[PDB]
Ligand binder design. Structure first.
Ligand SMILES: Nc1ncnc2c1ncn2[C@@H]1O[C@H](COP(=O)(O)OP(=O)(O)O)[C@@H](O)[C@H]1O
Length: 278
């Protein structure tokens, strides 16, 4: 029977609440919306730890409005973690992440994310119509806007050939989309959302040459005048990026555009030489 000391004052509902696994992020009291101007991103001396070494160590960079930054490096280096931090999926222990001059930890998370389009490695399809799957990107959007995003994503024509056009039930219950179609839906959702910043985590699988090239074209489209951070797997992404950060063990070991990193003859040059295969 009778629980004592502090335990007699414990709220069980609070204990259940604390048992939840993702143990997330809170808006600071009075936080206002992010005053988004053109999407300049800055990490200043960022440190971050999931547990107990540092996952990210003194990470500093800027992405100027509309430029693309590619993160490259071995697995485990901390690339995806960087995208996660910009999304405020976790708080940082030291340093500062700003968008347009503003600490992202001091604005509402909802306003922050309303400005960020996430293109994940693989696309979640909902048991829902192709239209509502796209509208997942901005759930208040008109059918007209959904069409327009799909037109821009290069998926409109394939949708028109589905038996119910934009009404076609997709997902596991519905019509199976091709690999190309699925990725384009993610692109369309992002176009529809029309954010100022894109966090792109490239798939480590690829379709055939023709689809890869088309998909890659469509992606370049969605990013071209948006501030973009891409965890790059494709060589063409890196070649054409405005800046590349080479991450190793949480640290940016070297950085610059492609040609400048080659001419540096360091770690990125070693990678490029290895892929080249003289
Ligand atoms: N959710 C997590 N909990 C604990 N450690 C993690 C978690 N996610 C990633 N890590 C570790 O953080 C380090 C960086 O991972 P990640 O940022 O995904 O690297 P990358 O994208 O470069 O492969 C890796 O060692 C990974 O094992």
């Amino acid at each position: 029977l009778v629980p004592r000391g502090s335990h007699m004052f414990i709220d069980m509902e609070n204990m259940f609440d604390l048992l939840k696994e993702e143990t997330e992020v809170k808006d600071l009291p009075g936080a206002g919306p992010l005053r988004f101007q053109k999407g300049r991103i800055e990490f200043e001396n960022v440190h971050f730890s999931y547990a107990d070494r540092e996952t990210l160590q003194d990470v500093s960079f800027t992405v100027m409005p509309g430029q693309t930054l590619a993160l490259v490096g071995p697995s485990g280096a901390g690339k995806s973690t960087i995208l996660r931090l910009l999304f405020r999926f976790y708080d940082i222990s030291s340093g500062c992440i700003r968008i347009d001059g503003q600490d992202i930890s001091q604005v509402t998370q909802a306003s922050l994310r309303s400005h960020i389009g996430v293109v994940p490695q693989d696309t979640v399809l909902f048991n829902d119509t192709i239209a509502d799957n796209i509208r997942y990107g901005r759930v208040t959007a008109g059918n007209d806007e959904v069409e327009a995003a799909a037109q821009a994503a290069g998926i409109h024509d394939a949708i028109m050939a589905f038996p119910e056009g934009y009404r076609t039930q997709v997902g596991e219950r519905g019509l199976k989309l091709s690999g190309g179609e699925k990725q384009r839906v993610a692109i369309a959702r992002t176009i529809l959302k029309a954010p100022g910043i894109i966090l792109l985590d490239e798939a480590t699988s690829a379709l055939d040459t023709s689809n890869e090239r088309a998909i890659q074209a469509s992606l370049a489209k969605v990013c071209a005048n948006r501030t973009t951070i891409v965890v790059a797997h494709r060589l063409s992404t890196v070649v054409n990026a405005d800046q590349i950060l080479v991450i190793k063990d949480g640290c940016i070991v070297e950085r610059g555009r492609h040609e400048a990193l080659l001419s540096r003859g360091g770690v990125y040059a070693d990678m490029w030489q290895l892929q080249q295969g003289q």
